Amino acid sequence: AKTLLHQYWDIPEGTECHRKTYAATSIGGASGLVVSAYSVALKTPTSFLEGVARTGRYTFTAAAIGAIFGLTSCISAQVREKPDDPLNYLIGGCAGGLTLGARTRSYGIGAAACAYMGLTAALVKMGQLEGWKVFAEPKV
Amino acid sequence: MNPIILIIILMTVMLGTIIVMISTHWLLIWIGFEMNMLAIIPIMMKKHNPRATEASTKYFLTQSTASMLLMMAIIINLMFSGQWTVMKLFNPMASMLMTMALAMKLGMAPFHFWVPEVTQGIPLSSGLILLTWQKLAPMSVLYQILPSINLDLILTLSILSITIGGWGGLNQTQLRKIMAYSSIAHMGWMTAVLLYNPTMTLLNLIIYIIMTSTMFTLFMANSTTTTLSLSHTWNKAPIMTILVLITLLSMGGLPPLSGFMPKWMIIQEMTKNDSIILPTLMAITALLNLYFYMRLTYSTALTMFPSTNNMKMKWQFPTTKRMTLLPTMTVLSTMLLPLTPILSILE
Amino acid sequence: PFFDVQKKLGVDLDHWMTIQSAEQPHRIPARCHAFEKEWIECAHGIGSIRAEKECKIEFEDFRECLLRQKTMKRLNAIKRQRDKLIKEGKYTPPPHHSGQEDLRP
Amino acid sequence: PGIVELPSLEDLKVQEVKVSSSVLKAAAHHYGAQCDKPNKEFMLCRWEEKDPRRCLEEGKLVNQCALEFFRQIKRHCAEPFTEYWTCIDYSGLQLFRRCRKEQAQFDKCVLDKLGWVRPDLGELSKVTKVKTDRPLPENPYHSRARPEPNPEVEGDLKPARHGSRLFFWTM
Amino acid sequence: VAAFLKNVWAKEPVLVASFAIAGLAVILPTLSPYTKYSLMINRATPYNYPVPLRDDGNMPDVPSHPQDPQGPSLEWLKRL
Amino acid sequence: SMMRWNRERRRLQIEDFEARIALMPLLQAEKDRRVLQMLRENLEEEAT
Amino acid sequence: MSLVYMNIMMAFTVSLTGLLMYRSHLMSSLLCLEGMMLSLFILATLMILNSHFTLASMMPIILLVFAACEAALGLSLLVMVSNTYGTDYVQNLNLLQC
Amino acid sequence: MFMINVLTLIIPILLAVAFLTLVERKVLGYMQFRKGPNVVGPYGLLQPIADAIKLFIKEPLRPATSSISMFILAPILALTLALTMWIPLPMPYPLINMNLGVLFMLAMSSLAVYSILWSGWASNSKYALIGALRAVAQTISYEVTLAIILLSVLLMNGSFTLSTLIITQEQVWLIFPAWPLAMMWFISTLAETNRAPFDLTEGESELVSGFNVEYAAGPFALFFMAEYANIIMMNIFTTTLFLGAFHNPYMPELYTINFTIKSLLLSITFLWIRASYPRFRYDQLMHLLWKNFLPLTLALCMWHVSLPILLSSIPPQT
Amino acid sequence: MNLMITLLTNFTLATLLVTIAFWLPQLNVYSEKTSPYECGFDPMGSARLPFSMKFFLVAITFLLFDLEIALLLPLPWASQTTNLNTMLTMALLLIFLLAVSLAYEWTQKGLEWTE
Amino acid sequence: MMTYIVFILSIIFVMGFVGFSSKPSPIYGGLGLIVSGGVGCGIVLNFGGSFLGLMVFLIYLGGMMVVFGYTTAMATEQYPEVWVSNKVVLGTFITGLLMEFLMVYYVLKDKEVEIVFKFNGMGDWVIYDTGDSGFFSEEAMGIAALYSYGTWLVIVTGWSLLIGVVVIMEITRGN
Ligand SMILES: CCCCCCCCCCCCCCCCCC(=O)OC[C@H](COP(=O)([O-])OCC[N+](C)(C)C)OC(=O)CCCCCCCCCCCCCCCCC
Ligand SMILES: CCCCCCCCCCCCCCCCCC(=O)OC[C@H](COP(=O)(O)OCCN)OC(=O)CCCCCCCCCCCCCCCCC
Ligand SMILES: CCCCCCCCCCCCCCCCCC(=O)OC[C@H](COP(=O)(O)OCCN)OC(=O)CCCCCCCCCCCCCCCCC
């Protein structure tokens, strides 16, 4: 789950939408698999078919989130010609939130997910620009 | 229970803890862990109800599996090292297995499931002994092997347990489940700082032990185990309501009370190394912990819930309980903040 | 809390077991006693950071004495090349590796 | 790393003491008593430098001495020695206590012919001193240079500068 | 205490015999003088090889031959 | 009777160990030479 | 390392996946626990005997002693569980869910 | 020529098992005022042959409600465990010289119980399960005292090797300094072999036929010769432990004939014990080895630990 | 090597007699011959019912005492030491602790069977 | 093939482990753990420690017989799934056996596998030693030295066992 992020981040932004779309869809698929596995372990499905249907629905939802997020961000950075900008990732996060609202079939979840995932995606671009560390190695 | 047998079992529990604490051998560490677990099993079976059997079985299975992982990590270190000394591990596989074993022993998420159930199913005194004494030997062993723990794994465990404990503490009306989720959050707080400065972890351990001991002694003295049973204390002894009010205010990290000192020093230590997002997230989940503390103190102190008729019969009798060290521990749990540089003695 | 009681009191409880080069019943030596002695004496009193930086050669040589990764690796290379040479037909084993050579003692 | 060193096969060739283990066990005490000096020189060197490649000429010398002792035995008392080692060799565990008669016969013949006295109980396990001419090996373990130790804390303990120096605390 | 001993020997003599045997086994090595001979016999059993020391020149106590007079002898093991 | 026979057996055991100790240097020399010869034979065939 | 180590740790991993996935029988999980301790014993004594750590030969006896002590504790807890409910099924221990 | 040695070990022991069934039936006749089998042949020498041929031409009778795998596996395990029991026994040279033979007998004694347990469990019967649990209780009664008796006896031998037990008592018999240990050892092997008065498994009165109440002929004969080989070798084990004979390395037949006579007299005493006493309960046996044998054995183990230190009589371990 | 040959010889001697005891004689197998034997009458329930055991405490302490005697078996080799007094003291103390455990069970009616 | 004796014994070891870790029925789980203990005793006996193998075999046989008594008392049902009687048990047994034989074929072809550590392909006769042990056995002398060196180990083990007896007697009390 480390080499997937390094596969995503090495491409320059706003250059090739297809490779970034595939990489972000891979991130979404991995997130969906781990979430669905925890879901079927902790909450037992009714039968086999229900379990595989729930797992597939979860990974398709998260794969859609990643795919359209990466496509929207790369398209925006291509059109604007400003690749090192958090605005592209803000539009990508809102497009992903709209996708989550369409997957859940509700507008309130869509609007809330647009706002919050846009804020988090913009903050992620800011951290990538300025080298913010979350799991920072000890210094002193 | 025979008091001689109970005294012998308690001294054996303490003996296992010091055998872990003073040994220079991994096998002796493991022996101390085994003897501690097998001596604290019957303390949890003091009242002999089915819930005690359930709690003892779940605790036994969790500690057994954690001990197996501990022994596997020890044996892999023996393979790749040829020695036995309690220091850093010479293999990342052994370090990861040892970290998960000590996380399972500490009740850290996502190995946190047994803690509220085990805490609920046993009496209040056994829960106090569990949540205070049993959470020292894994912390000691984690203090010994801090050169070898993977930072990402331990930080993931710490923030995961903080978030999960703070979220799970919002849906409980029993006091023991509330205390278990609070314990999970506090172990996340301590181990988030262990790789940066372990003196902060020792200070947090001491303050958390004092605070939760004061609260468990208060609950034992009032003989209340649910919030609706706690709400009768204003008709029984209002001073105990004042005491639980100030201790719940301190437990949420509200200054100028002594419970804010650990979180303040954790934030102080973790920003010397340019980690700013993480202490902010831990602060917000500490706010969630303060929320369910505020709900409890609204129930017991700041309002007068309706009482019953037999409370008059309880008024006519003065208490004869053995509230050992309750005022000293309450004072230490409330007003230890102007003596903050005392923490240097743990260096 | 490594409350070290053993050095404070002067007794030993598990110090005689913790290393491979300690005192043994009638002085039975281990397989890698000398390598453990060299690694221990290399990294005494300098701390763990300087131990992993300034005794890497001694420690990795001791670790190769323990598990023997590279020894069986070289033996695997020799065995595989000899088998391929035998199968292909460019090599014949000598008589002293066949079963009799009027052994030395 | 380094190419490992090994003496050639011409350096390892020697005449062998080709006898069974019963021949060695029967005349063990006489061999230990008579040939103590090259055996103990070889043992001292082999325990001192911890290397069989540097301990070859002394093994050669100990083989010549053992062969000379057995060739001396063969010249005088071949038949009592033959009967003695046969009576030793019949036993499954090679017991000493089943052939005390051949012990007395061999001891009497050797003592009257050559004048060798068997060691007493506990004598061959004694620890001796060996005078030899080889220099003492300075580095038998081939240890590298030891790392520099940490500097030692020294000096009088002054009081802390301006107290705690922790946030706003003046002491 | 004699009446109690008579009663316990009348009721369960096996426990009395076991307690007497265990007490005998506990208190006899303290008072017996033959244990040091067992210690010396165990010490004087040559499992290892007696490696010799380098003759620097000042060591007259250690012998130069197994038949030299100086050194630890085992006459007492023969006599006992 | 068992004490007498056990002490005699210990004397016999010490005598056997003394015989083995007297035999040790010759066996050690042959073992060193055999090990070095076998290593040289393995090395000389390793080049081929 | 050697392939016997592969098989011993592979047996340990089999019994670990056996213990962590229950089959509605507590005693079978106890058997898997004893299998894991047996695997630890075998692995420890293999390396100890190979590396000639002679003083450590007393260790696996102590490890197996504590294994049997915790097994006896598990059996006693199982007697209590089977004396409360009809059987020893692990799904009956669900009172602490509310 | 090892297979010839193995065959010449394993054939005479089962021949002697058949003739022990003959001798046991004759002695159990002659003590109870009557005769044994004396009609089939000259003084009944052909009765074991007739019994053996009869049992192998009768119906096999595998039950429908029984798990067939363990049902067939248990008698094979019983016979194989009784047959590999005899291997390190020195008469005066064992088939396989072993450094630790005593622990091998102890481990195989632990393993041989499982044939009884699985034959009881596999045959879907209540009487078979009763016999199986009685065997379980009997084993947890006797095993600790058996192992600690043998431990406290071997402390004067110096090692677990059975051949050293010949040398360690070549002066005097080992039954003299451990006569109480000899009596409790004899009782413990009476309980081990499921013989009277500690039968408690194949009880023909409390049950009908015990764990083999469903086993028809052929498979039942495997348990019969397994048990009789067990009693013969256990008497042989006692004879080696406490009644060692004079051994000449040039003439081993003297030790063989002395040892054979002593073990035959021990088996005669075994059948003598069989035809004299009522059978115990299966809880009275548990209160026998624990309340009466175990404390005295712990005391005797203290005594036999301190005594070689006391008299400087520590035996050699070589 | 000889031990595996001996074990295999014993095993194929044992499995030869069973295999000739199943195929040789004439068989007459019906749906009455293989019924469970309950002294002539039909059984009242299955034979796989829980057969309750009263000696559970004695079995648990059999495990503990088996491990106590497992610790005690190195004594013949441990008597060949030099630190003889410490070995004697630890052997005596271990056996005394075993006897203390047995006596505590005896005084607390643990060896007495339930019901 | 005979040089791979410990390999064959370890394959029977893993076969028994996956036989009883499927948890079919505790009777058959007991049979599987008996098999695994016996062949593990065999493995450690070819590595030289005969005493340790005999002790682990004896201890596990006693424990397995007592727990057999327990499951005949406590863990039993009307129709025990001995083997093949349940779908998931047979499936996981076949899965474990297939995985084990797969990695055996893999290590007997490439002569090197990488599961998280790295394991070599030859037999384990190579890692032996060419020297002699003299007139003693190392494992027996170590567990003999348990009494003369490990007094602290003796103290903690005896105390743990005594309080274990106390613990199990005060657990099964009922009130
Ligand atoms: C192989 C060689 C020969 C072996 C000897 C045996 C051959 C003859 C066998 C006879 C028939 C046996 C049939 C089975 C009997 C089973 C019952 C049985 O035996 O139960 C055991 C019986 C049990 O007795 P019990 O059943 O009456 O128990 C009564 C229990 N209460 C009171 C609670 C009701 O005896 C024992 O347990 C004693 C064991 C042997 C003790 C040996 C002591 C030796 C002397 C010590 C010293 C004495 C002097 C004083 C102290 C001095 C100190 C310095
Ligand atoms: C210091 C010596 C070494 C000590 C450590 C080693 C001990 C080795 C032996 C271990 C014995 C373990 C079992 C002991 C159990 C004692 C308690 C007990 O069960 O007593 C019961 C018995 C009366 O029988 P009852 O009440 O009917 O029992 C129920 C059914 N039988 O009660 C009795 O019969 C009375 C029991 C107590 C009194 C015994 C007195 C023996 C005196 C012997 C002579 C003096 C020996 C010197 C040492 C002093 C000993 C007190
Ligand atoms: C499905 C049900 C089961 C069906 C199959 C049943 C198979 C037969 C079961 C009975 C036999 C089990 C044997 C278990 C191991 C016994 C080990 C043993 O007997 O060791 C004795 C001996 C010890 O040697 P030592 O004292 O050190 O002296 C040699 C020094 N010169 O050792 C020696 O002398 C060494 C001889 C060679 C040893 C080779 C290694 C052991 C071989 C084990 C094979 C597999 C056994 C499987 C047992 C399964 C039991 C359920």
I32-35: long-range pairs with CB below 8 Å, 24+: I33/H59, I33/H61, I34/H61, I34/H62, I34/H63, I34/H64, I34/H65, I35/H63, I35/H64, I35/H65
Give the C-alpha separation, B233 to B314, whole Å.
11
Identify the helix (H) or strand (E) that includes residue J120. Answer: strand J117-120
Centre of ligand 2 to C-alpha I96, Å, is 13
CA E67 to chain centre: 27
- Region of residue H51 (phi > 0: left; psi between -120 and 50: alpha; otherwise: beta): alpha
* Sign of the Cα pseudo-torsion (H277, H282, H284, H287, in order): positive
| Residue I113 domain flag | no
Q: Which residue has the tokens 């316990």?
A: E8
Q: A74, A21 in Cβ contact below 8 A?
A: yes
Q: Where are the domains of chain G?
A: 1-86
Q: Is H212 in contact with H94 (CB distance < 8 Å)?
A: no
CATH number of the structural domain spanning residue I64? 1.20.58.1610
C-alpha–C-alpha distance, residues B164 and B103, integer Å:
14
Q: State how far the Cα of H20 lies from the Cα of H235, in Å rounded to an integer.
A: 13
All residues of chain F having their beta carbon less than 8 Å from the beta carbon of residue H318 are 13, 16-17
Residues paired with residue D130 on neighbouring β-strands, in sequence order: E54
Nearest to H318 by CA among H178, H167, H170, H171: H167
Say which DSSP state B53 is in.
H
Asked whether the beta carbons of D129 and D108 are under 8 A apart, the reply is no
Report CB contact under 8 Å: H318, F13. yes
Q: For residue H104, what is the DSSP state?
A: H
User: How far is the C-alpha of B30 from the C-alpha of D140, rounded, in Å?
Assistant: 39
Among B170, B168, B209, smallest CA distance to B186 is for B209
Beta partners for J120?
J112
Q: What are the residues whose beta carbons fall under 8 Å from the beta carbon of J110, sequence distance 6 or more?
A: J121
Q: What distance in angstroms lies between residue H102's CA and the mean position of ligand 1's atoms?
A: 25
H helix or E strand, kind and range, residue J117 = strand J117-120
Separation of alpha carbons D58 and D42, rounded Å: 5
CA–CA separation, J49 vs J56, rounded Å? 11
Which residue of C35, C38, C48 to mutate against D (max D Cβ within 10 Å)? C38
Quick one: angle between helices B198-222 and B260-270, nearest 10?
A: 160
What is the number of the ligand 1 atom nearest to the C-alpha of E20? 53
DSSP string, G7-76: HHHHHHHHHHHHHHS--S-HHHHHHHHHHHHHHHHHHHHHHHHHTT-GGGGGHHHHHHHHHHHHHHHHHH
Residue B129 in tokens? 């002994």
- How many C-beta neighbours within 10 Å does residue H272 have? 12
Q: Which two tokens stand for residue I50?
A: 């829980």
Q: How far apart are CA J3 and CA I109, in angstroms?
A: 56
Ligand 3 mean position, distance from CA I3 (Å): 7
Q: Which structure tokens are listed for A100?
A: 């989550």
Nearest 5 degrees, angle CA J6-CA F34-CA F13?
75
- Taking residue D35's Cβ as centre, other Cβ atoms within 10 Å add up to 18
Instruction: Give the relative orientation of helices E2-11 and E13-31 as an angle to the nearest 10 degrees.
Output: 120
The bound ligand whose nearest atom lies closest to the alpha carbon of J6 is 3
CATH (residue range G1-86): 1.10.287.3510
DSSP class of residue J115 equals E
Chain F contact set for D99 (CB, 8 A) = none
What 3-state DSSP class applies to H127? helix
List, as one string, the DSSP characters of I60-108.
HHHHHHHHHHHHHTTHHHHTT-S-HHHHHHHHHHHHHHHHHHHHHHHHT
> Which residues make Cβ contacts (< 8 Å) with residue H266, sequence separation at least 6?
H235, H238, H239
For residue H208, how far is the Cα from the chain centroid? 23
- Coil/strand/helix, residue B145: coil
Which tokens sit at J66? 């007592």
**Cβ contact B102:B110 at 8 Å:** no
Using alpha carbons, list the distances in angstroms from residue C33 to B75, G4, G52, H313: 19, 24, 10, 36
Residue H202 CA to residue H194 CA, distance in Å, equals 8
Query: Residue C36: helix, strand or coil by DSSP?
Result: helix
CA–CA distance, H31 with H29 (Å, rounded to integer): 6
Q: What is the widest separation between alpha-carbon atoms in chain D?
A: 103
The crossing angle, in degrees rounded to 10, of helices D36-49 and D57-76 is 160
Phi, psi of E2 (to 5 degrees): -75, -35
Per-residue tokens: G18: 């056996």
**B173 and B219 in contact (C-beta within 8 Å)?**
no
Helix%, strand%, coil% for chain G, nearest 5:
80, 0, 20
Distance from the Cα of residue H280 to its chain's centroid = 19
Nearest by CB: I94 against J62, J73, J158: J158
Q: Which of F2, F3, F16 sits opposite H318 (nearest CB)?
A: F16
Read off the tokens for A130: 């300025």
Token duo for residue G75: 């059996």
* Contacting residues for J81 by C-beta, under 8 A, at least 6 apart: J24, J25, J89
C-beta atoms of D29 and F39 within 8 A: no
Residue J142 in tokens: 């170590």
For the beta carbon of residue I49, count every other beta carbon within 10 angstroms.
12
CA–CA dist C76, H102 (Å, integer) = 42
Residue B81: name the closest of B145, B20, B154, B16 by CA. B145
Mutate to test the pocket of ligand 1, among H292, H293, H297, H303 (most ligand atoms within 8 A of CB): H292
Distance of CA E32 from the midpoint of ligand 2 (Å): 26
Q: Is I97 in the pocket of ligand 2 (CB under 6 A)?
A: no
**Does the CA dihedral H20-H21-H26-H31 come out positive or negative?**
positive
What type of residue sits at position A14?
G
* Residue B215 · residue B247 · CB < 8 Å: yes
User: DSSP string spanning chain D?
Assistant: -PPPP---TTTS--------HHHHHHTHHHHHHHTHHHHHHHHHHHHHH--SSS-SHHHHHHHHHHHHHHHHHHHH-HHHHHHHHHHHHHSSS--STT-HHHHHHHHHHHHHHT--PPP-TTTTT---EE---SPPPS-SS---PPPPPPPPP-S--PPPTTTT-STT---
Which residues, other chains included, contact E15 with Cβ-Cβ below 8 Å and sequence gap of 6+?
Answer: E8, H295
Q: Alpha-carbon distance C4 to B86, whole Å?
A: 12
Distance, in Å, from the CA atom of H169 to the CA atom of H315, rounded to the nearest integer, reads: 12
Tell me the C-alpha distance between A20 and B244, whole Å.
Answer: 56
Cα distances (angstroms) measured from residue A119 to each of B274, D101, G65: 22, 104, 58
First to last CA, chain I: 53
What is the token pair recorded at C34?
């000398």
Print the domain residue range for I70: 1-108
Distance CA D159, CA D163 (A): 8
DSSP A106: -
| D 18-57 → E contacts, CB under 8 A | 32-33, 36, 40, 43-44, 47-48
Find the D89 Cα to ligand 3 centroid distance in Å: 32
- The token pair at D42 is 């070889």
Residue A88 near residue A73 (C-beta atoms within 8 A): yes
What Cα–Cα distance (Å) separates residue F34 from each residue in C26, C98, C101, F28?
Answer: 27, 17, 13, 10
Are the beta carbons of F5 and H318 separated by less than 8 Å? no
**Radius of gyration over alpha carbons of chain H, in Å?**
20
- Closest-lying ligand 1 atom to the alpha carbon of residue H296: 41
CA distances for B64 relative to B41, B68, B184, D121, J124, angstroms: 12, 6, 20, 56, 32
Residues in chain C: 105
Look at residue E5 and give its three-state secondary structure.
Answer: helix
Token pair listed for H59: 């119906």
Rg over CA atoms, chain F: 20
- Strand J112-115 vs strand E53-54: parallel, antiparallel, or unpaired? unpaired
Spatial separation of the C-alpha atoms in residues J98 and G17, rounded to whole Å: 16
Phi/psi of residue C17, each to 5°?
-100, -25
Alpha carbon distance, N-terminus to C-terminus of chain J: 61
Residue D166, in any domain of the structure: no
Go through the domains of chain J in sequence order and give each one's CATH number. Answer: 2-172 (1.20.120.1200)
Of D65, D64, D71, the closest CA to residue D23 belongs to D71
CB atoms within 10 A of CB H54: 11
CB proximity list for J135: less than 8 A, separation 6 or greater: E47, F17, F20, H318
Which of C50, C56, C64, C71 is the best residue to mutate to test the D interface, defined by the most D CB atoms within 10 Å of its own CB? C50
- Select from I60, I63, I52, I66 the least CA-distant residue to I110: I60
Reduce the secondary structure of B93-127 to three states and give it as a string. Answer: HHHHHHHHHHHHHHCCCCCCCHHHHHHHHCCHHHH
- The DSSP secondary-structure symbol of B342 reads G
Q: How far apart are CA B44 and CA B51, in angstroms?
A: 10
In this structure, are residues H187 and H208 in contact, taking their beta carbons and an 8 Å threshold?
Answer: no
Query: Residue I7: CB within 6 Å of ligand 3?
Result: yes
Q: How was this structure determined?
A: cryo-EM
Q: Which two tokens stand for residue B60?
A: 């036994």
User: What does the block give as tokens for H45?
Assistant: 């020498």
What are the tokens at B153?
Answer: 């794994």
**How far is residue I55 from each of residues H3, H138, H286, I113, measured CA to CA in Å?**
46, 11, 10, 6
Place of tokens 């040289």: F40
Domain boundaries, position D117: 1-137
Q: Is J44 in the pocket of ligand 3 (CB under 6 A)?
A: no
**Do the Cβ atoms of G40 and J46 come closer than 8 Å?**
no
Tell me the one-letter amino acid at J75.
Answer: A
DSSP B226: B
Residue with tokens 């020997």: E9
Running DSSP on this structure, what letter comes out for residue B199? H
Task: Evaluate whether chains I and G are touching (3 or more beta carbon pairs less than 8 Å apart).
Answer: yes
Q: CA-to-CA distance for J103 and J32, rounded, in angstroms?
A: 21
Nearest to D70 by CA among D55, D61, D81, D83: D81
Q: I48 is written with which tokens?
A: 């796989």
> In the block, which residue shows the tokens 């066992």?
J161
Count of CB atoms situated within 10 Å of the CB of B319: 12
Quoted resolution (Å): 3.4
Ligand in closest contact with the CA of E2: 2
Q: Tell me, what DSSP letter sits at residue B174?
A: B
Amino acid at I84: L
Q: Determine contact, residues H312/E34, Cβ cutoff 8 Å.
A: yes
Single-letter code of the amino acid located at D13: K
Non-local (6+) Cβ contacts of F35 within 8 A are D52, J130
CA distance A115 to A113: 5
Q: How many residues does chain B have?
A: 347
**Backbone phi, psi, residue F40, to 5°:** -65, -40
Phi, psi of J119 (to 5 degrees): -115, 135
- In the three-class reduction of DSSP (H, G, I as helix; E, B as strand; rest coil), residue A96 is classed as helix
User: For residue C26, what are its two tokens?
Assistant: 């009638």
* Whole-angstrom distance, CA of residue H135 vs CA of residue H199: 9
Q: Which helix (H) or strand (E) holds J119?
A: strand J117-120
**Total domain count for chain I?**
1
Q: What is the DSSP secondary-structure string of H165-220?
A: HHHTTSSS-TTTTTHHHHHHHHHHHHHHTT-TTS--SS-TTTSSSGGGSS--TTHH
Give the separation between CA H56 and CA A78, rounded to whole angstroms.
Answer: 92
Number of domains present in the structure of chain D: 1
E strand intervals along chain B = none
- Distances in Å between the alpha carbon of H160 and those of H239, H316, H317? 16, 12, 9
Indicate the helix (H) or strand (E) that contains E41.
helix E35-43
Q: Over A16-60, what HEC string results?
A: CHHHHHHHHHHHHHHHHHHHHHHHHHHCCCCCHHHHHHHHHHHHH
Nearest to H50 by CA among H216, H179, H217: H217
Tokens representing residue B282 in the block: 């831990």
How far apart CA F13 and CA E80 sit, in angstroms, is 17
